[PDB]
Amino acid sequence: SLLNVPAGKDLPEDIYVVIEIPANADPIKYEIDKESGALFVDRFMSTAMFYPCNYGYINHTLSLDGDPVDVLVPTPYPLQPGSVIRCRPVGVLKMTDEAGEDAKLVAVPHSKLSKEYDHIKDVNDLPELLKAQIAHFFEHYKDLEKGKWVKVEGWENAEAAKAEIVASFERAKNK
Amino acid sequence: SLLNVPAGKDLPEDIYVVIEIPANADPIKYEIDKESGALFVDRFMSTAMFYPCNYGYINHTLSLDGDPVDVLVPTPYPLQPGSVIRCRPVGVLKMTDEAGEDAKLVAVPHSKLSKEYDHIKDVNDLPELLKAQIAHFFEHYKDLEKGKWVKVEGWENAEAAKAEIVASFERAKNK
Amino acid sequence: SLLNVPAGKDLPEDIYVVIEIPANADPIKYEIDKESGALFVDRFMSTAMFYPCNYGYINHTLSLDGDPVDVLVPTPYPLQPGSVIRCRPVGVLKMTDEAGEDAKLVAVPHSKLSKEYDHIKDVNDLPELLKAQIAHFFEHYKDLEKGKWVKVEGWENAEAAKAEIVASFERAKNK
C-alpha cells in the first residue's frame, strides 16, 4: 500500500513524494490515512484558490506539528492524487501557523523522469512568479477558516530542504 | 487498503463512505473488489445518464441483496473514485429492483470537512431538484439492460437511514 | 492491494488488466510498484502524443524484457489509472525495441461489462484507423529519448495474444 512506500531511494537528494492534491485542481484537500493508507477527503477548502504545484508528503518522516514533511512538486501536467513521484529537493518555504511551525519544501521531478528540471539546482532557479504564487497561496488559503493564520517567513536553499528531510526522518519512529 | 477502512468512527451519525463513482462523471460503473480492494470497472452504463452525487458504500456492512450499504454523497466538487469521505446520513431513497430491494442512503459531508451541509439535518432539507434528480436517475439508468427494472417507492428520514446502517453492519458477518 | 489482483478469472479468454495510463490523457507514464503496489510516475513523455487506448498490464505474468505482459484496452470512456478491467484478448502488435522484444496485446472489454465489443473476435475486427494509430504511436512516442528505438513488425491474432498470456504467466514465479 501507500504506507509501504520508501521515503526515498537515496536520501536526501533523491526522494519519493506521495501526492495528495494535484496542481490547479478542485479545492478538495485530500490526505492519506495512517491505518488504511487510503485517500481521505480531509477538507473542502473555503477560499477560491488552487495549489500552484502538486502537493504531498514524504513517507516515513515526521514534522514537529505531528505530520510527515510536506513537499510541493511542480510537473508539466497534474498528477493523480495518491500517486508517487521520485524527485529532488531544491528549497523550502518557511512559514508559521498555529503554532507548530509549518515549513513546506519544494522538490522537482528527478532527472530519470524528465530533464526539464535539471537546471533547477536551488531555490533561486525556480521562477519568481511560481515562488510568489506559492507564498501567496499559503498566505491566504486559510483566510476563511476562523482561528487559522499563516505568516510566511521566507525561502531557504536545497540544503535547508535536505536538512528538514533528514531531521524529520529520524524524528522518524524513534519515539 | 480500502478493505481496512472503518464503517464509521461513531456509527451511525458519523460514517465513512468509500467512493466508487464521482458526481457528473463518465458513465463507467466502478466497484471495489472484495479480495484486492482494487477499483474494478464493474460495467459500462448504457443509458446517457450520470450520477447526480458521488456514489459509494459503507465498509463493513451488508445489505440483503448481498452488497454493502450504498450511499450517495453530494459535494461541491466531484471526488476521486476510491477515496473516502466522512459524512453524516440524512435520508434514504427506498426502491426495489429485480433481486429483492435496493435502498440507497444519502449522506452529506461531515461538519469537520465543511459547514455547507450543517443545515441539512433530514431528507427534506435536501433541495427538491436534487431529490427528483436522484429518484429519476435510479428510475431510468438501467432501462437499456433487459431483465433489469427499478421501482422507486420513496424517501425516508435520517433515522430510517441510520437504521439501515446499524442493521447492515451487524448483518455484517458472513462472506 | 493491486498486487493481489488475479491475472484473469479464466485464462486466457478472460483476463484482468491493471490500467496505468488512460486513453487520450496527459503524457505522464505511470507504473505500479512491485513492493508498494502504488502508482508511480515512471516518466514524463517527451513527444506530444497520447495513448490511443487505456494501457496496462496483466498481473502475475512476465515478459522476457523483465516486465508483465502489456495490454492495450479500448473503452468508450477513459479509465482511472490504477483500476482494473476484465477483458478478452483479441490481438497483438509485435514490435522490437531491445533490450527485450516488446509485444503489446490488445484486449477488449469483456461482454459482462459491455456488449459493444462482442463482434470483435480477432485483430482484424478492430478498425483500421485505431490499428494504424496504435502502430504509429509506438513507432514514435520514444523519438525524443536518445538511444531508444522501436520497430513495429506487425499484428497477430487472438490465439497469438492468448499464447503470450499463457507463456508469460508461467515464465513467472518459477524462479
Swiss-Prot record, chains A, B, C:
CDD domains: pyrophosphatase. One of its GO terms (molecular function) is inorganic triphosphate phosphatase activity. GO terms for cellular component: cytosol; membrane. One of its GO terms (biological process) is phosphate-containing compound metabolic process. Keywords: Cytoplasm, Hydrolase, Magnesium, Metal-binding. Signal peptide: none annotated. Mg(2+) 2 binds at D70. Its cofactor is Mg(2+). It is found in: Cytoplasm. Its EC number is 3.6.1.1. InterPro entries: Pyrophosphatase (IPR008162), Pyrophosphatase_sf (IPR036649). It comes from the Bacteria. Pfam families: Pyrophosphatase. It catalyses: diphosphate + H2O = 2 phosphate + H(+). Substrate binds at K29, R43, Y55, Y141. The keyword Metal-binding applies. Belongs to the PPase family. HAMAP family: Inorganic_PPase. Homohexamer. Catalyzes the hydrolysis of inorganic pyrophosphate (PPi) forming two phosphate ions. NCBIfam families: PRK01250.1. This is Inorganic pyrophosphatase. It comes from Escherichia coli (strain K12).
